Design a binder for this molecule. Sequence first.
Ligand SMILES: [Cl-]
Ligand SMILES: [Cl-]
Ligand SMILES: [Zn+2]
Ligand SMILES: [Zn+2]
Lengths: 350, 350
Amino acid sequence: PSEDFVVTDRGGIVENSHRVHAAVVDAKGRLLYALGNPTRMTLARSAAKPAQALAILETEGVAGYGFDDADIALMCASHSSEDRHIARTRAMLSKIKAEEADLRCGGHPSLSEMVNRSWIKQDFIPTAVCSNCSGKHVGMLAGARAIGAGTDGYHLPDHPMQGRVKRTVAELCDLDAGDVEWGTDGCNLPTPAFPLDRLGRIYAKLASAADGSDAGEGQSTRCAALAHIFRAMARHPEMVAGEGRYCTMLMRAFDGALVGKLGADASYAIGVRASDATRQLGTDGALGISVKIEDGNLEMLYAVVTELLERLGIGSPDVRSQLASFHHPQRVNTMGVTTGGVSFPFKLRG
Amino acid sequence: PSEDFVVTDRGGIVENSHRVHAAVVDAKGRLLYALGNPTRMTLARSAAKPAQALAILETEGVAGYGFDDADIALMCASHSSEDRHIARTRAMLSKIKAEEADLRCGGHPSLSEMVNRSWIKQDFIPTAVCSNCSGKHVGMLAGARAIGAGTDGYHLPDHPMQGRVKRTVAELCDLDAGDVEWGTDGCNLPTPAFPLDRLGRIYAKLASAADGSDAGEGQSTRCAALAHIFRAMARHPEMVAGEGRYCTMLMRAFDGALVGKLGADASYAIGVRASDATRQLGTDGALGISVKIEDGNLEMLYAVVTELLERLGIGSPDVRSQLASFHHPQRVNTMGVTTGGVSFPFKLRG
Ligand SMILES: [Cl-]
Ligand SMILES: [Cl-]
Ligand SMILES: [Zn+2]
Ligand SMILES: [Zn+2]
């Protein structure tokens, strides 16, 4: 096993170390570069959301509801529960003539510290419509209604909408059904685990489909839907997360060049459209990147992802400088004295 | 290296893993049991506070201020900034005729989520007296005043109070000064790093001194002062942390049998008075335990510390059941469904 870490120090003394796994794959999922164990069996959590959104958009009759790009971005989101996210959740429920009572996700403290502060000040108790997964849940309800299935149990593994999700995830991974494992997520849906490189493969396919669409290529409905998902996330990155969130700041900085998505417990995935940077890495098409911090630390994840983009030459120093607060998180004490820092002793292997 | 972990799962699928280091030592610091690397160079952080409190109590003239056992417990604390902790800090300042403006620590968000919620609701900005380390800082200012040193720089390495702390830490560890490294803490004081087993040694000495005092044994001034610290922490565990906090609940459950203390970034130390349990582990005196979670996760620390007490046979099932919420942390989703749990794939080696 490779020994790839992100390390924090206090005065040069090692504080914490965090094991890093990463895969960099081409449009077919061939491994180009790695850290740690690039095939680590990994719970993709929210980083699987574009695959779930594909299952929703491929459900017959869902096109009739008129979901727009911002709605699809919300299906792909771990949003901050800003008022605009709650409003768009309600808009999507109304498009399918459903009610908040039909949701089978629950409320939680906001993924944004500033939103949660406003909630605490107002004694607000979040409900189902506030879930960071609310857009995905409305999409699943939409799919269940569109094919005339029951809506009560849309979130249960035996429901046809979850059969569609399970098949679609395995297909995008190029895995047999038996090679994808399933548990239950915080939002009470089935959630997949598969080798980490296949999360990179999903995002390589998203970016590859975006390149194919832009070139005016004849596309299957699946490739057209993957291109639409890429475009929706890149055009509405504030729907995918929210103000001050890594994913939103990353996708705004890159202005269409890539899409990026967090998974709970510190997974990350990026789909990179073909560029001078991807060609310099030795591939003639789109690229996927997937990362897992073994111990689940989110601060370390954002620092590593930003360091990996710098090492891969993705963006420019000016584009990546928008992410400086995440790349090198502050280690300043209560008296304004810098006491430590973050370092990246890992080495990409080709 | 041994492969000692604490793991979380979702439906039996590995979520996060965390490397565990631990030392179990006798009263002289002989290693009895280990996990991971028992000599890992480790920043003790707040787990060093009993050693710093010894340096304060061994400063000539500090006895004249009339600090009581709850004040000494506050010197040993990472408190939750409850109103009782803030009031006692200001009472301690009054005993030494010093003011909040003399403190060289700063305010921070409360270590208690429930306290921090109350602060957010009231727009409260914490100040120096709110520091979780405020009791240690007042004790250092007390020492500086008692010997007629300057107070302005009590926190600087060249100050006699820091010279006394540095010597006292090396003496309790039985280390040469050059084998203790120093950084700067969150509270803006020097903070020591030394091999993890020597943190266990400090706490074995605390508990050994408590045994000597209780048995009416003639004691050195250092052993009497260590026994006083042990008694203060065990009698006033709400000063050491606060309501709902692991350290307070642990020390209340054990009712004088042990003291325990958190260090930031997931170190922990316990001093165990001689008992049927310590004799069964193969020592005729007190025991020390020290733990570090490599990646710094606190939830995992409290789970591992509680698991270690069970494995070592310290306490009884009834005493340890008070800590069941920490031992086996809840993994319940937003809809009340249990999605996973914590497991302890580590093996104590003798
Ligand atoms: Cl949220
Ligand atoms: Cl700090
Ligand atoms: Zn979800
Ligand atoms: Zn401190």
